[model samples]
Every structure is written in C-alpha cells, then in structure tokens.
Target: PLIVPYNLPLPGGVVPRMLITILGTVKPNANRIALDFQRGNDVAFHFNPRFNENNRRVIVCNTKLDNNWGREERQSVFPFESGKPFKIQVLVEPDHFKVAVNDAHLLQYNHRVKKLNEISKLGISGDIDLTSASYTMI
Candidate 1:
C-alpha cells in the first residue's frame, strides 16, 4: 500500500550501478522527508531534506550503525521547493551514492558501511505524497 513511512524489501539487495528512483509531491509547509537505505535496523545511508524555516535549508546525509548516527554530510544547495513534485534518483556505486534531483546533480554520499548488499530495505517517510518508488540496475 502507498503510505508515508513505508518500508519495502530490496530483494537480492543493492549493488553497483543500481538506481533507485522516487517521485513524490512535497506538501506545502512540509518540514522534512527522508529516504533511507537500511538493513535490519542499521541505516546504510540517510538522505534527508529539511525545509524548516527556522534553520538553513539543507540535505543531510549520514549513516547509522548500531542505532547511532554518524557525522553528517550536508548539502546547502537546495533543489526542491514546497508544494511541488520532485524527480529524484540515487545512483548506487561501489563507494557512494550519486543523488540527482529535478534532473540536476545534487550530492554524493560516500558509503560508510562497506557491505552494500547488506542494505536490504528502503524506507520513505515525512511530508510527501508517494507517487511512485522503484529501482533498476545495470
């Protein structure tokens, strides 16, 4: 079912050249939304966009191991606007993920976890209509 905070299995898991694409509409006044590359409970990568007016807008990427988040990798060039639809793709590579939003290169998050295929789940949540979510690989 289509829902925020959804978790879907990534059967056979992720690998180099894999692409994860998401289409969603941000709610006007949306504060945040997150897409996570996860396994069991650890998050291999956290792609989080914050639209809170109280702070500088940023896309914060990080890794969570053993329930603790690591030092964040931040992007200041915001690519998304409120109340608009977004086309985002995360291209998987051997060492990192290349994230492009609205057809523009956004940010690259270097993998903190060495085992890529150990990430067996994808999670989506916070302030957006989930239009579609899918993955493909070369």
Candidate 2:
C-alpha cells in the first residue's frame, strides 16, 4: 500500500474535494491507493499524453489492506499528462464520494467507514502534492 499522511480533515458532506500535482513518475503495475478521481479501487488510471512520445500512465489500485474496497462503480477521466500539474477533486456524500477532474470529469466511491468522521490517511506510492486540498461538511 502506498502510504501518505492525511493533512486535510474529511468532513461529512455531499462532496469533499482533493487536488493532486504529480511531481514524479508513478510506475505502471505498481499498487497504490489514491483519493484522486482517477484512482479507482484495485484498478489502474493510465495517462499517455501525446507530447512525450511515450505514453504517460497513471495507475490507481485499491489498497487491499482497506479490504480492497473500491469506488462504488467504474468511472474514468483519462489522457492525464505527466510533468504537467493536474487537479483531482473528490466529493463526499453520505454513503459515497463523487470525484471530478478539472470539473470536466466525474466518478464516485462508497463510504467505507459509514459515518461522518475525519479522514487522515491517503495510501500512495508515488510522489504527489496534497497541499492544496480542502474539505467541506454539508
């Protein structure tokens, strides 16, 4: 499981959002847990921006340590570019969390804890920026 410290507090609401700026390369076939819109449970989010001539891929997998529980359904917003900073947003509802990217893409995940509480852990294996994250409880 990719390990990361949860700095922002997750509150109970219709939506909670997260933003990630990729600084380094996240290898393919490697397992990692991400709260990003593209990171699906036990699934992979790949990005191959046409600029590099090499396919830039981002992989999202569910952390089995968390019961391998993944998003309530399958959703994707792809063609994510590497090196360039991107924004990922997660909206938290009572029973699930909805995700959006650049406000152009969307996805959803079920609430694992089943209650309104603070989220302080985001499983990650690659280097990313969570400093710009914010939460709303509604």
Candidate 3:
C-alpha cells in the first residue's frame, strides 16, 4: 500500500457547523487512512481508520500538538472495508465533530482543540485513492 498525503486549503479557516467530506476507496489489504484537521503545526482533530493495526480493528480519534498526541478515543465499529469505496463526512461543531461513514452515523468526538476557526488545513493520508474531497458550511 502507498501512503500519500493530500492537503486541502481552508480559507478563512473552519467555521461552525461545516462539513468536510471524503470520497475514496480503500486499497486491498489497506493499512489505514488518516484525516487530520490542523491549525498551523497543531492538529485539531485526527480521524484514523485502521483496517489492520496492533492486531485490532478500530477507529482512532485524537488531537496533536507539538508532536504530542492527545488521549485517543477508539471506536470498534469498523465502517470501512478494504477494497471498497466509501464516503465519510466530518461535521465541524463548536464542541465536537460528528462523523458519518457511508451515509451512516459513525461517531462523535469532542473537540480537543477548542478554536474551531483556527483549523485552517485538512490533510488526508494513507492507503486509499481519493475520488473527491470537499467542504461546505451548513
């Protein structure tokens, strides 16, 4: 599997109730996919889905600052399947992020970095082919 990072520009930074959507297909025998919402060098939210890692199946959500990762929140419901196409929505809220995978509600992660407007970058990485990535305020 190839790991590639794609960055999306978020002009004016992230606003409340915004939605970031990713459309892609997981590579066969994929390792993982990580979506990072960042502000400068700090990661406001790190949303990761690991098909195989640490001998476990889970979605890991966290934040990072100065290379230090925050407390991880793990979800066992694996909505992602290798070699299958998927759609993921990350809704930005004032207090948390509401995520949905394949049109189904996945999980909600409370904000670790509170300044939503400071989250000016969106980055995606890992073993997947991105079809489209977009954002909208709603």
Candidate 4:
C-alpha cells in the first residue's frame, strides 16, 4: 500500500544507524532499504552503469539505506540532477534487482538474499511525484 509522506525532502536513503519511525504500519526491515529521491539536494545514486543495459530503467535514491555492506551495495540508482525533473524506477527480477531514475540517468543493483516470507511491507515518501508514482510485484 502506497501512502503519502508526512513531510517533504525525506532524508533520501536509509542509514545504517538511522531509525525510521513512520507514523503508520510501514516498517523497513532492519535489513531492507528506503529510496527517497527528490529535487533539492545535489545527490546522485551512483553505481557502475556497466552492469546495466542501455535501456534499463533505474531506481535512484534521494538518500541512502540502513545496514552494512549488503545494504551499502544497494546505493542510490539515481542522482539528484538539479534543474531537471526525474523519478525513481525499480525493476524487480526473480532474485536480483535493478533500480533506475528518470529513464536511465542512474541505476542501483539490489540483492535479495532474504526469504520472501521475511518481507511484507512497502513504503513511499516525498512531496513530489506522489500521484505519478506506482508499483507492482510480478
């Protein structure tokens, strides 16, 4: 279930020592990640694009996530390019994952080694592109 954010400029990504206390039932597993990309900070989701295809869309983060190396690898898939309009795109493969922004400007590769049963929640935050944001698990 996608919900509106209580605030704007959501800290961007999840931090290892960060504690995300939302107002509702949205809980980012102590092991999962949170992507918050918006227009403000001069931040970009950086990763080796060599692993991504030319047309592959990515899900960039406005911030970082919470965890060690496993979470560190899931960096922002997009960079916050100022004076431009962009959004996050997540491609969920069977076991692997790909995230992009504004088509293919940036990309992040996420590994899902956790069992599906350990997951049961999804979260969305930000003041822009709220209505235009959408997702589905195939």
Candidate 5:
C-alpha cells in the first residue's frame, strides 16, 4: 500500500487552469480522511470525507486563514465507497474549486484564501490506500 499521512509539494503551486487528481481506495477500517491544499500555515482548501456517521455519509469543505477555520460547506451526496477504488479531481477555477468523483461532477468550493498560486503543498492523511496523486494543466 502507498504510505499514509503524506504531504507532497505541488509544483508552481496552483492556478486557475490546473487540475489536481487523486486515486485511492478506502479501507474497510476507514472512518474519515482529509485532503488539503495549504500555503504555509493557511489552508486554501480543506476537503474532507467522513464515514461511519450516525447519518448518511457526507463531505465537508472549508478553508483556514490566519490559523482559524471558516464556516463549513457540507455536501450530502457521498459518492465514495468503502473498500472501493476512487478517482477524484479538483479543477482550479477563477472563483472556485470544482471537485468531481469518478469523472462525475460533484461539488464546487468558493476560493476563500484567494491567491491560488500560494497553495504549494498537498496534505493527505487517514484510513485510505493512496494509489497516486498528481496535477496537470487543463
């Protein structure tokens, strides 16, 4: 299995016309996982998938600035499945980040931290088997 709790450097940071893709499989023992785009201590995007909740599955999106987290934008649809592989993409847009699962449109998060280019780090951690993580121009 690919190592867990990996923080990878994103080259040239992020721009409006770029795409970030991650391939992974959720472990049966999974509970929750987080994928974050960070600039120094500030988080540009906090994409979190939560499982084993009392209610149906949900995805939570937020941003952190000045070390304080902003209000949450929770999405009710849960496209990811436990013990199954997944392909997730984050499309960098001028005003928001568009996320898709398995090539299907999922959700969009408004740019809170602004200056997308400052987000030079990607942080991945929790109960999932990481296959690959990458980025490319759109």
Candidate 6:
C-alpha cells in the first residue's frame, strides 16, 4: 500500500483561501520528500524536505519553468521526523501560499507565477506514506 509520487487534480484551480491538506508518515530511511503544484509545463510550487545527516533539517522551496528550476529558497524550521506522521496544510491566498505543519504556521511563499487558476495539479513524491489527502475550496 505504498505509492510513491501520488497525484491529484485541482479542478477549477486554486482560489483565495482554498486549502490543501496532506497527512503522511515519513519512511524510516527517508532521504527526502517533496510536494509540487503544477500547471502544464510550469511548476507553481515545489516544497521539499531534506533530512540532514548532521541532525539538522532543511526545507527547500522553488518553482520550475522552461525545464529549469528557479532560485531556491532553502531555510526553514523543519518539523518532520523519520517514521513519524505529519499533517501539512497549504492555504491559497491572493498573492502567496501559507503553509503549516502539524497545525502550526510554517512559512509563506509568494506567487512566482501570477496565474493562480492555472495551477491545477498536485504531485507528491519521495519516501513517504500517504494516509489521507483532502482539499477545500473557499
């Protein structure tokens, strides 16, 4: 029952206040985890968590366009642990995406691609076990 890189459709695309929730457990030997919001050939958001060998954690956020990745923003208070369940919430806003982990505020990513409605796909990848996924349109 382990599916890597699961995908979901966001019909009508994202609007202000729309929420996407992902509940999953990190694999014991997880090296990384990533969530992506995509629109055709463009990637609106790429949220990646990298587990450090030195016991430090890192979360990298960026977008992809024209087959190349944009400048990455990598600096966050990582809240994920190996073999632990985590709940992540992404809220669509007028100009940015507000994200939270375990119901706690995490960070806000400003829109890199202005057309919100065009971001109509969600993809989950890396070493993780998905328990539930849900979305609410506002």
Candidate 2 lDDT tens digits, 7-83:
23323312333333322233333233244222223222222222222343333323232335334333334534433
Alpha-carbon shift of residue 1 in model 1 (angstroms): 8.3
In candidate 1, what are the lDDT values of residues 12-66, reduced to their tens digit? 7789999998998998988998999997789999999999736778888999999
For residues 1-138, write the lDDT of model 5, one tens digit per residue. 568888878887899888988899988967898999999899989999998668568899999889899999999888988899999899999999999999999999998887777799999887899999888997
TM-score of each: 0.95, 0.47, 0.94, 0.40, 0.95, 0.93
State in Å the error of residue 116, model 5. 1.0
lDDT tens readout by residue for model 4, 3-110: 464232323333222222222222322111244322222212223221233544233223232422222343334344323344555554444335545556334344
What clash count goes with each model? 0, 12, 0, 20, 0, 0
lDDT of 6 by residue, 17-130 (tens): 899999999999788989999988889999999997367689999999988999998765889989999999999989899999999999889999888899999899888999
* Model 3 poorest 10 in a row by lDDT: 1-10
The alpha-carbon deviation from the true structure for residue 90 of candidate 4, after best TM-score superposition, in angstroms, is 0.5
Candidate 4 vs candidate 5, lDDT winner? 5
| Candidate 3 lDDT by residue in tens digits, 1-138 | 223588988887787778999999988999899999998999988999987777887999999999999899999999898899999998877778999999999999988787777889999998898888889988
Error of 4 at 127 (Å): 5.8
CA lDDT of every candidate: 0.89, 0.38, 0.88, 0.34, 0.89, 0.89
Ranking by TM-score: 1, 5, 3, 6, 2, 4
| Candidate 5 least-lDDT 10 residues | 51-60
- Where does candidate 6 stray beyond 4 Å? 53-55
lDDT of 2: 0.38
Q: State how far residue 129 of model 5 sits from its true place (Å).
A: 0.4
